[PDB]
């Protein structure tokens, strides 16, 4: 049940809501008021999802799919079988997510650490809210949201993309991808660096941070340092997801045409717009 | 076909890999225990990994994990219920006792050494050629606690030499003794240094270091521990 | 508000650190560079020194040759006009030889030869730099994690412009050097193989990419959350568990039911990132050599 050093940490307090009421654990897990909140939202949501599955007449997970209301319903409510169920399920997800974040906050307090983790998570939550709330509202129907199904959701991605041409040309999409790639690069390195120091060549003594900083200056002439790379990681990650939201929130709202075409602005600057030759002249 | 082969293969690879990953993270704090310290009955599907031994630089010996676990300090906590899973209430002053968000681990009572075998962290006064190169130099600024009362004055900065970084502020108290304050728990302002976790009256309780030009892993933990714990336990004294 | 430790609130400097001197040939290391106070607010302010050596120079020279060989081609396309060059910079493209030449090294220069030269340059550039990551580690007595991690990346690149073009029978199947052109090639590569979303490696690869972000978010925010107990000093924490490591592990145990150790978390890390291009490489390799259309394959599973 407890890690060899856990007991002295399991003291009362830190709860945001409800005092000592839910201030307790279940196996390794911490409950807290929000422990309960998330459970309830999670229970409800899964139920509704199964209920959608009978109306659909399949129990096969590769097939199950809960779709939003069709565009004709705009931002109004829709019949269960006709889009209501997704709308509730979406409400329930949100409930789950936010609650899961606030529990993280409550654990943070009991342990006496910073709130960076709940913090970073809120970016994930905000990306999800962008795709099922902010964008549809702004566009004008729940129908612009993505459906909850394993492959159907990949389909929405593909269809929504190809609507504006090759989505690769969405400029904030370019930026968002550069982080995803960069972050992975940096996670690759960080991990590798620490391990190689902690697990040197056979029979040698554990290396030190000094070695880590040296290994990198030797390699590329600079080392961001042990505090840096952790600040770096948090940032690349949060940024990747920040730009991911951005590229979507603008798509279909302030730009509805082909993304490639938006680049004509550059190429049509009057100072070289008419100069012959090249690719565009 | 080949493709089918490859993907089935991979899902198998991936499964033994997680297994590996998982057993490696079982190198500390395992095996599990009951609230009374007796070994718990259900330790999960995963076995303890076979021990590995680390050779610590500067002849500081070896470390073998997993290995015999022991807190090596008293815990002043008492059960608040008759069944498993409820908090344990401090039986004294959690701060003074070092439980809760004020907990510290019995790390070695030796300082962290740099790659050369010299003390990693030093008061800047004794760090030949170090200076505040940017930002507000705290040194000389009064220190304010969450109760908005002055508690002391910065009389130095303890720097991390190999990473060239400010780790702690040393503070001079009203009785002429000094304490270290983690850099990460204070806001350096234009005319003062503000500490939200501790009220002026608790600065004296901050554990002291035995030698004035060195800190040990044990003393770092006891200090950081203490200051962090203020956040929850000084709470009645904090106003804003 | 409380301090967050995303940016330093006081910078301290000392004599330029010339670093550990294991078995490293000190005649090769450079001189210390300046110090960016800019950088200093985020991480280390000290630039340099850097280690040159034979492999560094070869790598660094081939590296520039590659880049320049592409550059002259762009200029030739731009009508040597600096204005067009700027206008049309992302439209220019150095394309592989036509399918006609196959795996031939005899394609005319304007018709694909120049692409081979550039690639040849990149090949040597990249491999030498790989050997560089390895040696730099050896000379400090360190594990070779970094070189092996690097090898994963190399895998996907090897497969894209070398191994797959060769197994298909022609260089024309490789990726063109160009900003918009390599985007198009990617988009088109999926169309031709029946939508890469049905390539289960592609799907796996995305999971590990998404995951890398998830994890580096988790790890980073955690270490920052406990840097108030010297969390970032991970090597010593491994060697002697501090409260930092404890609070870290527990926050996670209490949230989701299990947890890492300080050495452990970094194994999760290196593998989550390395699996991105590992799986990736495989998904692409089978694409068009063994499987012509992932949807059809998806219907049968063979
Ligand atoms: C086709 C694909 C080919 C494409 C090429 C791309 C290859 C890229 C691979 C990169 C691997 C990154 C790994 C990072 C790492 O640990 O590196 C350090 C590790 C140790 O570095 P060191 O400096 O030598 O030692 C320092 C310390 O002494 C020791 O330090 P240490 O303790 O840190 O190292 C110990 C480490 C040792 O690490 C290794 O030994 C690496 C293993 C490499 C595996 C390669 C993956 C191939 C993917 C296959 C997918 C199948 C699809 C077909 O332990 C592990 O990580 C164990 C891995 C567990 C694997 C689980 C296997 C399960 C098998 C199935 C069992 C049944 C399940 C039940 C159901 O490096 C290696 O061991 C080198 C591996 C190189 C092999 C490359 C393949 C050649 C082709
Ligand atoms: C954000 C970008 C796009 C999108 C584009 C893609 C693309 C492109 C792909 C996926 C893939 C996946 N997507 Mg998606 N996906 C989106 C939004 C979502 C949402 C959401 C609520 O917002 C979720 C939960 C998922 C979940 C998933 C997984 C089924 C799968 C692997 C992801 C992964 O490894 O992440 C990393 C996270 C982890 C490793 C942590 C553990 C995650 C586990 C696997 C979560 C599974 C949840 C799932 C089974 C449903 C549970 C819900 C109920 C409680 C039962 N996507 C939006 C619309 N998604 C890949 C796939 O192969 O699936 C077809 C794929 O190729
Ligand atoms: C229309 C587009 C198609 C499609 C077609 C492809 C194709 C084609 C490929 C991918 C690939 C990938 N796709 Mg896909 N993909 C689509 C939609 C998606 C979506 C989505 C819809 O949300 C996502 C999230 C992804 C995500 C991804 C990545 C997981 C994956 C590449 C990982 C990587 O990091 O390589 C980045 C890393 C590298 C390329 C390694 C290179 C390393 C070298 C050595 C670097 C050298 C640098 C050089 C020498 C210059 C030096 C630098 C200078 C000094 C500055 N795809 C659709 C279906 N996708 C790749 C893959 O693996 O697929 C299975 C791939 O080949
Ligand atoms: C495991 C997967 C991820 C990964 C890992 C990875 N990559 C790696 C490593 C590892 C573990 C290394 O050790 C190695 C490295 O040394 O990094 C520091 C590398 C590396 N990955 C790199 C790039 C890279 N990795 C990528 C991807 C990934 N790498 C994956 C996501 C990508 C993409 C496309 O996503 C890129 C672009 C290099 C930084 C480095 C390998 C360097 C190399 O091989 O150099 C060879 C040649 C040269 C010396 C060329 C130099 C020519 C330049 C001077 C021209 C450009 C001039 C330009 C205009 C300059 C200005 C830039 C401004 C920003 C200031
Ligand atoms: C912001 C950067 C990245 C990030 C960070 C991040 N994620 C995080 C955190 C952080 C910092 C956490 O602390 C938290 C965590 O605890 O991790 C272990 C979390 C987490 N990220 C998760 C998943 C996740 N994160 C993702 C993405 C990312 N997370 C980013 C790329 C993704 C994808 C698709 O990329 C996924 C799948 C969880 C493992 C965990 C949060 C767990 C949680 O919220 O529990 C509460 C909810 C439930 C128990 C289930 C609720 C059931 C619903 C009511 C119904 C189901 C509806 C759903 C909409 C159906 C979708 C079906 C699909 C097929 C489309
Ligand atoms: C111990 O040493 C060290 C480590 O440890 C092992 C390391 O890991 C590393 C390795 C780390 C790295 C190389 C990381 C370096 C990071 C980068 C180069 C940055 C990565 C990110 C990018 C390339 C993306 C750049 C994007 C930018 C600048 C965009 C900025 C914002 C905007 C333009 C505004 C957005 C608005 C838009 C588009 C509006 C759109 C409008 C309409 C459509 C209308 C190093 C060096 C190290 O030293
Ligand atoms: C250095 O330090 C660090 C650590 O350790 C010292 C750490 O561990 C970690 C954490 C990281 C790891 C252990 C590595 C592996 C992690 C991942 C690959 C992330 C992906 C995670 C998952 C797939 C797990 C997702 C699981 C969840 C959200 C919980 C599972 C939960 C349930 C089945 C029940 C959910 C709970 C409910 C309903 C409410 C509570 C319960 C009641 C009954 C009420 C990090 C980041 C770290 O930086
Ligand atoms: C300012 O102007 C001057 C001229 C000074 C410049 O220098 C400007 C230069 C620029 C304009 C340069 C611009 C360069 C880019 C736009 C480059 C973009 C490159 C990419 C987007 C590349 C993407 C993908 C590349 C891939 C996957 C390459 C793979 C290569 C290989 C695996 C190598 C394979 C080897 C070959 C075929 C030959 C092997 C032969 C043997 C004998 C072994
Ligand atoms: C966090 C809330 C998320 C809700 C997701 C969608 C709910 C749609 C609410 C509309 C209900 C009725 N209406 C049209 C009268 O407003
Ligand atoms: C590092 C361990 C975590 C790995 C995450 C494994 C779950 C990913 C599930 C992806 C679903 C994939 N597939 C093959 C059907 O496309
Ligand atoms: C993917 C999530 C995995 C989480 C693993 C959690 C381990 C819990 C150990 C069993 C505890 C049991 N319980 C709840 C019945 O008391
Ligand atoms: C895709 C990520 C999935 C994470 C893998 C799940 C590992 C669960 C380990 C549970 C450990 C149980 N224990 C011993 C803590 O009680
Ligand atoms: Fe780390």
Q: Are the C-beta atoms of B115 and A197 separated by less than 8 Å?
A: no
Q: State yes or no: cis peptide before C49, omega within 30 of 0.
A: yes
Nearest to A200 by CA among B37, B24, B57: B57
Q: Are the C-beta atoms of B45 and B63 separated by less than 8 Å?
A: no
The neighbour count for residue C301, using CB atoms within 10 Å, is 11
What is d(CA C229, CA B218) in angstroms, rounded to the nearest whole number? 11
Residue nearest to atom 14 of ligand 3 (CA): C202
Q: If residue A30 lies in a helix (H) or strand (E), which one and from where to where?
A: strand A29-30
Integer angstrom CA distances of residue A156 from A90, A134, A137, A159, A163 = 16, 17, 17, 5, 10
C100 annotated binding-site participant = no
Q: If residue A25 lies in a helix (H) or strand (E), which one and from where to where?
A: strand A25-26
Q: How far is the CA of C281 from the centre of ligand 3 (A)?
A: 10
Using the Cβ of B33 and the Cβ atoms of chain C, whether some distance falls under 8 Å is answered with: no
What is d(CA C216, CA A188) in angstroms, rounded to the nearest whole number? 10
What domains appear along chain A, each with residue ranges and CATH number? 1-163 (1.20.85.10), 164-263 (1.20.85.10)
Kindly identify the ligand whose nearest atom is closest to the C-alpha of A97.
5
CB contact under 8 A, A218 and C51: yes
Integer angstrom CA distances of residue A14 from A39, A104, A109, A207, C248 = 20, 11, 5, 39, 17
In chain A, helix, strand, coil percent, each to 5? 60, 5, 35
φ, ψ at A20 (rounded to 5°)? -90, 0
CB contact under 8 A, C141 and A207: yes
Four-point Cα dihedral C90, C92, C93, C94, nearest 10:
-130
CATH superfamily of C144-302: Photosystem II protein D1-like (1.20.85.10)
In a 3-state reduction of DSSP, which class is residue A112?
A: coil
E-assigned strands of chain B? 52-55, 62-65, 77-79, 88-90, 121-123, 131-135, 142-145, 150-160, 165-173, 178-182, 187-188, 193-195
Q: Are the C-beta atoms of B98 and B225 separated by less than 8 Å?
A: yes
The chains in contact with chain B, meaning 3 or more Cβ pairs closer than 8 Å, are: A, C
What is d(CA B222, CA B206) in angstroms, rounded to the nearest whole number? 8
For A198, name the nearest residue in chain C, comparing CA atoms only. Answer: C235
* CATH 3.30.470.20 holds for C1-143: no
Beta pairing partners, A230: none
Method: X-ray
Contacts of B37 (CB under 8 A, 6+ apart): A7
Beta pairing partners, C66: none
What is d(CA A222, CA A214) in angstroms, rounded to the nearest whole number? 9
Q: State yes or no: cis peptide before C66, omega within 30 of 0.
A: no
At how many Å resolution was this determined?
3.1
What is d(CA C292, CA B190) in angstroms, rounded to the nearest whole number? 67
Q: If residue A119 lies in a helix (H) or strand (E), which one and from where to where?
A: helix A116-129
In a 3-state reduction of DSSP, which class is residue B132?
A: strand
Q: DSSP code of B204?
A: G
The residue extents of the domains of chain C are 1-143, 144-302
What is d(CA C242, CA C230) in angstroms, rounded to the nearest whole number? 8
What is d(CA B169, CA B186) in angstroms, rounded to the nearest whole number? 9
- The fold adopted by the segment(s) B107-237 is Photosynthetic Reaction Center; Chain H, domain 2 (3.90.50)
What is the separation of C-alpha C296 from the centre of its chain, rounded to a whole number of angstroms?
32
Four-point Cα dihedral A272, A273, A279, A281, nearest 10:
-110
The neighbour count for residue B37, using CB atoms within 10 Å, is 12
Name the C residues in 53-82 with CB < 8 Å from any B CB. none
In a 3-state reduction of DSSP, which class is residue B170?
A: strand
Compute the C-alpha angle B213/B219/B221, nearest 5°: 140
CB contact under 8 A, B105 and A7: no
Residues with CB under 6 A from ligand 4: A 181, 184-185, 188-189, 192, 219-220; C 59-60, 63-64, 67, 125-126, 129, 133, 146, 149-150, 152-153, 273-274, 276-277
- The pair of three-digit structure tokens given for residue A230, joined into one six-digit string: 């952790």
Residue nearest to atom 10 of ligand 12 (CA): C258
User: Are C1-143 and C144-302 in the same CATH fold?
Assistant: yes
CB contact under 8 A, A7 and B88: yes
The residue extents of the domains of chain B are 2-106, 107-237
Cβ A224 under 6 angstroms from ligand 6: yes
Annotated binding site of A for a ubiquinone: 216
Cβ contacts (< 8 Å) between A15 and chain B: which residues? Answer: none
Compute the C-alpha angle B94/B98/B101, nearest 5°: 75
Helix axes C145-158, C114-138, angle to 10 degrees: 170
Compute the C-alpha angle A4/A8/A14, nearest 5°: 125
In the CATH scheme, what is the code of domain B2-106? 4.10.540.10
Using a 10 angstrom Cβ sphere, with 0-12 exposed, 13-18 middle and 19 or more buried, the burial of residue C283 is: buried
φ, ψ at A251 (rounded to 5°)? -80, 120
Q: Are the C-beta atoms of A3 and C247 separated by less than 8 Å?
A: no
- Quickly tell me which residue has 């906050």 as its tokens: A105
Helix (H), strand (E), coil (C) string for chain C: CCCCCCCCCEEEECCCCCCCCCCCCCCCECCCCCECHHHHCCCCCEECCCECHHHHHHHHHHHHHHHHHHHHHHHHHCCCCHHHHHHCCCCCCECCCCHHHCCCCCCCHHHHHHHHHHHHHHHHHHHHHHHHHHHHHHCCCCCCHHHHHHHHHHHHHHHHHHHHHHHHCCHHHCCCECHHHHHHHHHHHHHHCCCHHHCHHHHHHHHHHHHHHHHHHHHHHHHHHCHHHCCCCHHHHHHCCCHHHHHHHHHHHHHHCCCCCHHHHHHHHHHHHHHHHHHHHHHHHCECCCECCHHHHHHHCC
């Amino acid at each position: 049940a407890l890690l060899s050093f856990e007991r002295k940490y399991r003291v009362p307090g830190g709860t945001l809501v409800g005092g000592n009421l839910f201030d307790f654990w279940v196996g390794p897990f911490y409950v807290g008021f929000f422990g309960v909140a998330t459970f309830f939202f999670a229970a409800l949501g899964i139920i509704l999802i199964a209920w959608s599955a009978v109306l659909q007449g399949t129990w096969n997970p590769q097939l199950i799919s809960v779709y939003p209301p069709a565009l004709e319903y705009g931002l109004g409510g829709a019949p269960l079988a006709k889009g209501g169920l997704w709308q509730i399920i979406t409400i329930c997800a949100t409930g789950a997510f936010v609650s899961w974040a606030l529990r993280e906050v409550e654990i943070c307090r009991k342990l006496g650490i910073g709130y960076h983790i709940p913090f970073a998570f809120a970016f994930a939550i905000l990306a999800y809210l962008t795709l099922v709330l902010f964008r549809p509202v702004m566009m004008g129907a729940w129908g612009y949201a993505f459906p909850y199904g394993i492959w159907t959701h990949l389909d929405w991605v593909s269809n929504t993309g190809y609507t504006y041409g090759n989505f690769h040309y969405n400029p904030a999409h370019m930026i968002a991808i550069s982080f995803f790639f960069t972050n992975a690069l940096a996670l690759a390195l960080h991990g590798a660096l620490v391990l190689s120091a902690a697990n040197p060549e056979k029979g040698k003594e554990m290396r030190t941070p000094d070695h880590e900083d040296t290994f990198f200056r030797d390699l590329v002439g600079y080392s961001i340092g042990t505090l840096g790379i952790h600040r770096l990681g948090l940032l690349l990650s949060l940024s990747a997801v920040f730009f991911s939201a951005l590229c979507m929130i603008i798509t279909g709202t302030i730009w509805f045409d082909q993304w490639v075409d938006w680049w004509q602005w550059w190429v049509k600057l009057p100072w070289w717009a008419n100069i012959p030759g090249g690719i565009n002249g | 076909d080949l493709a089918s082969l490859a993907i089935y293969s991979f899902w198998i690879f991936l499964a033994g890999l997680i297994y590996y990953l998982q057993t490696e993270n079982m190198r500390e704090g395992y095996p599990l225990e009951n609230e009374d310290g007796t070994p718990a009955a259900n330790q999960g599907p995963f076995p303890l990994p076979k021990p590995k031994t680390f050779i610590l630089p500067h002849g500081r010996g070896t470390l073998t994990v997993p290995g015999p676990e022991s807190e090596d300090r008293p815990i002043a906590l008492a059960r608040t219920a008759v069944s498993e899973g409820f908090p344990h209430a401090p039986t004294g002053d959690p701060m003074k006792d070092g439980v809760g968000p004020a907990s510290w681990v019995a790390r070695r009572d030796l300082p962290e050494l740099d790659g050369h075998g010299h003390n990693k962290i030093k008061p800047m006064k004794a760090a030949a050629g170090f200076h505040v190169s940017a930002g507000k130099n705290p040194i000389g600024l009064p220190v304010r606690g969450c109760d908005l009362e002055i508690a002391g004055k910065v009389v130095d900065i303890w720097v991390d030499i190999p990473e060239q970084m400010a780790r702690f502020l040393e503070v001079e108290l009203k009785d002429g003794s000094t304490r270290l304050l983690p850099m990460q728990m204070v806001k350096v302002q234009s005319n003062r240094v503000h500490v939200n976790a501790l009220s002026s009256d608790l600065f004296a309780g901050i554990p002291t270091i035995k030698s004035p030009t060195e800190v040990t892993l044990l003393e770092e933990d006891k200090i950081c521990g203490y200051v962090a714990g203020g956040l929850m336990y000084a709470a009645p004294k904090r106003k804003s | 508000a409380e301090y967050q430790n995303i940016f330093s609130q006081v910078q301290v400097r000392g004599p330029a650190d010339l670093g550990m001197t294991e078995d490293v040939n000190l005649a090769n290391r450079s001189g210390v560079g300046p110090f960016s106070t800019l950088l200093g607010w985020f991480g280390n302010a000290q630039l340099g020194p850097i280690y040159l050596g034979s492999l560094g120079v070869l790598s660094l020279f081939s590296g520039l040759m590659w880049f320049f060989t592409i550059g002259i081609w762009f200029w030739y396309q731009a009508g040597w006009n600096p204005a067009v060059f700027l206008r049309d910079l992302f439209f220019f493209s150095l394309e592989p030889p036509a399918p006609e030449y196959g795996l031939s090294f005899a394609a005319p220069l304007k018709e694909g030869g120049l692409w081979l030269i550039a690639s040849f340059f990149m090949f040597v550039a990249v491999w030498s730099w790989w050997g560089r990551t390895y040696l730099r580690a050896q000379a400090l007595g360190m594990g070779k994690h970094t070189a092996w991690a690097f090898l994963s990346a190399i895998w996907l690149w090897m497969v894209l412009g070398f191994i797959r073009p060769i197994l298909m029978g022609s260089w024309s199947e490789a990726v063109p050097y160009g900003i918009f052109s390599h985007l198009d090639w990617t988009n088109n590569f999926s169309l031709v193989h029946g939508n890469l979303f049905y390539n289960p490696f592609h799907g796996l690869s995305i999971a590990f990419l998404y995951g890398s972000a998830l994890l580096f978010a988790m790890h980073g925010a955690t270490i920052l959350a406990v840097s108030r107990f010297g969390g970032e000093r991970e090597l010593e924490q491994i060697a002697d568990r501090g409260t930092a490591a404890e609070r870290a592990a527990l926050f996670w145990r209490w949230t989701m039911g299990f947890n890492a150790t300080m050495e452990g978390i970094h194994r999760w890390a290196i593998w989550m990132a390395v699996l991105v291009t590992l799986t990736g490489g495989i998904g692409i390799l089978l694409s068009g050599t063994v499987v012509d259309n992932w949807y059809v394959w998806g219907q049968n599973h063979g």
